[PDB]
Amino acid sequence: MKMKRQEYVNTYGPTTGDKVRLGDTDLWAEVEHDYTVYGEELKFGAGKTIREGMGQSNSPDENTLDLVITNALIIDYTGIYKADIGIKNGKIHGIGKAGNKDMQDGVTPHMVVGVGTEALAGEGMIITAGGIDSHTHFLSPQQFPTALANGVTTMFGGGTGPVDGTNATTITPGVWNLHRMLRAAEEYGMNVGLLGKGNSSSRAQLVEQVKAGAIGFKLHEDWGTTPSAIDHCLSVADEYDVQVCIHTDTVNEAGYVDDTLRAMNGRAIHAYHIEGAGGGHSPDVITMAGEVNILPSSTTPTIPYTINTVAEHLDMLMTCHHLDKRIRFSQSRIRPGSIAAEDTLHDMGVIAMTSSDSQAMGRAGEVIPRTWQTADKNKKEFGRLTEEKGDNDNFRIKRYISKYTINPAITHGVSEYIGSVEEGKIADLVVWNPAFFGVKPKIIIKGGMVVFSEMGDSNASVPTPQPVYYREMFGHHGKAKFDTSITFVSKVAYENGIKEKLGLERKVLPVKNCRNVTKKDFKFNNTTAKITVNPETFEVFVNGKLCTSKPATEVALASRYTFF
Amino acid sequence: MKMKRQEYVNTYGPTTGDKVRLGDTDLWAEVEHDYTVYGEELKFGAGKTIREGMGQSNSPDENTLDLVITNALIIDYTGIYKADIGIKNGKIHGIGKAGNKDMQDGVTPHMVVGVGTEALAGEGMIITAGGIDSHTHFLSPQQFPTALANGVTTMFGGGTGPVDGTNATTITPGVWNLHRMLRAAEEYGMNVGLLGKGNSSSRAQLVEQVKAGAIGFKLHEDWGTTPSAIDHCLSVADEYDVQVCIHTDTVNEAGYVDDTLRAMNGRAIHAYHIEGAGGGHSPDVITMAGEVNILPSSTTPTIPYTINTVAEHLDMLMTCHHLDKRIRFSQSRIRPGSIAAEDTLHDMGVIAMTSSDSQAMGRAGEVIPRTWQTADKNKKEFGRLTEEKGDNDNFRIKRYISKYTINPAITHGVSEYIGSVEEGKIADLVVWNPAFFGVKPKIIIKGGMVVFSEMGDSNASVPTPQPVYYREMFGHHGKAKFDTSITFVSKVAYENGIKEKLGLERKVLPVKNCRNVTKKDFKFNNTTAKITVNPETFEVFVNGKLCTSKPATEVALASRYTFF
Amino acid sequence: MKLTPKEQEKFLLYYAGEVARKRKEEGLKLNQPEAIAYISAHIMDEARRGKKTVAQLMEECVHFLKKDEVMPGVGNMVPDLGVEANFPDGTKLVTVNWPIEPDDFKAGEIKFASDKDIELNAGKEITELKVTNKGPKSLHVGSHFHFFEANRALEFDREKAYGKRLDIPSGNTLRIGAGETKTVHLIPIGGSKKIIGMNGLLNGIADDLHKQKALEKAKHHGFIK
Amino acid sequence: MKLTPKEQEKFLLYYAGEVARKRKEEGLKLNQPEAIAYISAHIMDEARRGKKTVAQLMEECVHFLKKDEVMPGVGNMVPDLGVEANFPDGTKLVTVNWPIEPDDFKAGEIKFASDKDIELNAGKEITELKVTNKGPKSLHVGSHFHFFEANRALEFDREKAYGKRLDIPSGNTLRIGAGETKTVHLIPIGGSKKIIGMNGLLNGIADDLHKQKALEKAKHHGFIK
Ligand SMILES: [Fe+3]
């Protein structure tokens, strides 16, 4: 029978060839493929499809799903397509067509909807992987609900709480502090991984930290980012398969950017805040982004470049670093050039990741909105990418989503567990209403359970009455949080029973394959170039051409959605 | 640089669009796709690709392969394509492009060739999954080398040895005999699964057998395949997720074919020797093949239909069943009609499997040759299939390969472990030289190790000198055979520690998802029809159209290859 | 060469045949294994030549060796011979009945106590019953099958077959062809008459008490019209 | 006798040769295993006679069986044959290239999609470089070896070979004879260009940043004169 196109879309969501506007941005996602059989689509409700002996099987199966997300529009580096998502044992069991092979055609064999299956209607919703914030200052436990409320499910970084060292650096230093924080982590729903102090010219002190559970090391100028410290840190990182993060020598005390690059010696390193406002070699830190071994991220305050970016920074730097009011400027000439270039470099696929720098010159619940604000800004400025095939922004979308999902996962050695919507991976997923995509998520699923969601009045006759606000769900509570949350550690710690030894009840998993990740390993952001900075004008050059962007007067996913 | 097409093919084997003749048959396999990057192909040898810091990585990786099969031509239901195959932990780790991402372009991320990698040159060879023989009579342990020498790695059936019951039926009856045989299985390289006596009108005796380790039940007329016995057996098999195999009531004693079909009640059942020469309701057992619930197979002696098939049978039946010489005929009028139809039904995808009936009206080392002989015979009589897309027999090849690889695996509930060349499955593979495809294999890999191969003089300066004959390899010996071989059991037995309780050192795995496999579940052989037999002429009709074939005077993969 | 374990076996058989041929040429009477190998090698030779059919060979090899060409009792010791060989159409089984001509000597000879017939099922009460196979296909019924539960295609007074079996040798079957009418001889089942299974018309003791219930089940399932 | 397991194998091979000889005498076209055994037995015979050299036999056995003496496709199926036999000077391997004359039939025949050449390393920028082997011994350099790290005997502008490899088929080698001058074609190394090992001149990414250090190591180790 013939169903009117509007009626089909209302009932099941968009199909092949349909374009979805991402929030209030000018970005259009086109459905590349639909894995359904028209007429066999799953719908939950009274008199609907998912019923005993109909859409729900009465035949037992080894692949009976624990949860079915019906008619989802997946947005991932893997593609922008329409499919049913099947969760089983807190993992993405299958992606395709779910249902009952007894009564339906074209059912994916390992996607059985049965007696033990729970239903979640994804028709008309966007499903993405949970975001990974690889630049977290563990300053306040209140960052976690803010992060979840913005689609972030994993947090890498360091800290001890609101002490001066954490206020500046993403470092949990030494054995005792690492043990204390890993045990504190038990409380939360958020996946965590801690970085130790990398700023050492002695092996023993670095090794102690990896063995204490650190997923890597942070090198920060506040503890001295000298060439000696750069070499020693990477040497231990190479031995123990852990990642290194770097905030370079801003005041060029022990050497210039090239001297730091030389100390690295082509070894894998995660260069935090590549633009340079958050810190790093003045004015040429951005020149590192061109190098193949350099895995570059950007922190939220500089992305997207707006008419208030520079003004906000010429004071935000003074509160964070605690500088004299006698200091006025240098940053007023240096900063516009690199901040402008940063946006363009993101669009070019030169900067591979977006991160927060949470309460340490950056916002916790802003990674996701700011990534899409930049995508939107550049599409408005530089047009639809030449790379696009059709009347859609799919390639740019895939380039931008990779920045906070897959690329941080690859960098930190957790790409086998999380980072993307793929079969076999842990079910850390976010459900979005297209009108609120990138700004306000609906449901946060972690380890196959709902952990956080937008929820109305607790007394109310339905879950919709006002006030609708973000609340912790069952997956975030009791002993279920130990089933849905991961504390990442080094292989050495993992293999030596850190879980048992620290009495951690949470899922403990090792980080692996950190040392041989280059720019070539990323998804949609593999671009290498000869990046140069004029030391007089502070202008950024990509292979001799000028690299710049215009500051935004207004951004998408902001004013329409927030009260304050 | 430009390489002459002939030179490329000599060095790396065929590429996209090339057609390979399977043995001396008239079947042509076309390379559908090539996963390589021209110039980056892996070659092993002095001054070649797979060398320290070149094709072989010096960078440690979590995905360093244990074995690499370079430039293989995969022939599987999944496709006929060119790729490198990567084995790790006795499983197919990856299929694509193997090598070193440090020095090469387009390397599949989880296909790292490193220090711990062994090399096997598959350039110019055909790689297929190991065959599964669903109709094994455990009569003689000498069947195993014969089977391996013909590309068969898994054997399902039953028996006790050379006793009258085994000579006739695929049954290991009762607890004690099942325990004894599962312990005897330890000796071999072959994967095994045992069937118990399904012929019971009492629950207790059937349950005992599943709990003793049986993977299913055989219903054989020699123990009375009555409608009561059929119902009772299927009822227990439904409760315990095990398969049922049936040799029907030849003499129509308790009922006609329709009475047996009625007793089954649409439940999943494996109908051995569907044509009826080896047994079953005379003259209409073939009529069962049209039914959706019926999973049908053919035994080797009737396929392909030759000028000597009928003559051989009208005496081979008298030696097996031990009949009086007073008995002359009925089989002389009944048999041509069904035997001829059987070949056509295979080509039509009506009969889904090919098996052996080993030393019990069929040949152990003939499943694979006879399948291809039938494929070839049909290509020669009825031309290239209408289903084909191009100047190739790819669809027909995929239809025929499925008969002894994937379809038996689906039927017996082991499709998740074995049956096809797919990532994640156990590495049970066969390497073939195209000139000997389907008749004489080169190497037999089981659980990622070579277990059996064609080998020359043991004293000889190289492995090529005469006499070249089949010999057991390291994977078949010592404690390594326990690592490369599987003894399949029921879930109930598995879950109740049958391995520990019987002190089995072999890999013990449960059979699962047997009860809800219908014709729709098969690969390339999902054809259902209204099959009718004229009770006067014995002619077979498919949807009222005569289903027949002409007898072959000569067959491929025979006279050119064998001495006796 | 790629010699399969089955090909290695055939070389031994063929060599044994060649040694037997040599001994026959020397004028020696062949023994049991020599006679078998001599005939086997002939079959293997003809199959390679690929000019004769399996049917031709089965006929050609009857009395291939004559009584005076072999030792006494050899023919009786080998009543049948089987040899698989590759023909142009593939490997086929060549079955020869009486490959060696027999003589008066018999090893393992059974001498009967008496030539008198054996009275099977002695003293059991015989029930004569007219049966007609109204079905389109012929059928057989075994010695111990509960006659009452036979294929619904068979037309007879089922009440009279209740708790009975055929008075025929144990293991034998009676054939009733499509459309054929026969007079069968039925005897009451031995032991306790606890009939469990077959068509499930009884599933208990075949006593008078169970009879009406059984006849009703038979009618309901279509055995009794 | 003290028969070794290898001597037991050779008896089977020799007997197979004898059976094949018999079949050829019968006028039958030999198949793949028969043809191999027929030639093998000849080699084994000549070696025992100890009058012919290995060199003589290797030459004598080319087309030992003619196309019409064997079944079609047999020759193509057996492009080479190897047989170890005891000669007066000990066991030696007799290697025959084309022992059976081929015909128009080919089992496992590959039919090309096109006769057009395959463009290997497509789109990579070619660097022409003059190289001279100033050493006393000839040398070869493989397809994926970092050209810059080649034997110090080779004289060329090493700076121009930094982070490059030969634009030759994968697995092939280029020969530069003692004193020989050649024009080589170099292409940039694939993937990340993370060059670890060989002569340890680089041991890292072949970028501009590592270049001066690499050139200094090459000069210090004698690669650059
Ligand atoms: Fe910083």
Ligand SMILES: [Fe+3]
């Ligand atoms: Fe920071």
Ligand SMILES: [Fe+3]
């Ligand atoms: Fe059977």
Ligand SMILES: [Fe+3]
């Ligand atoms: Fe059988």
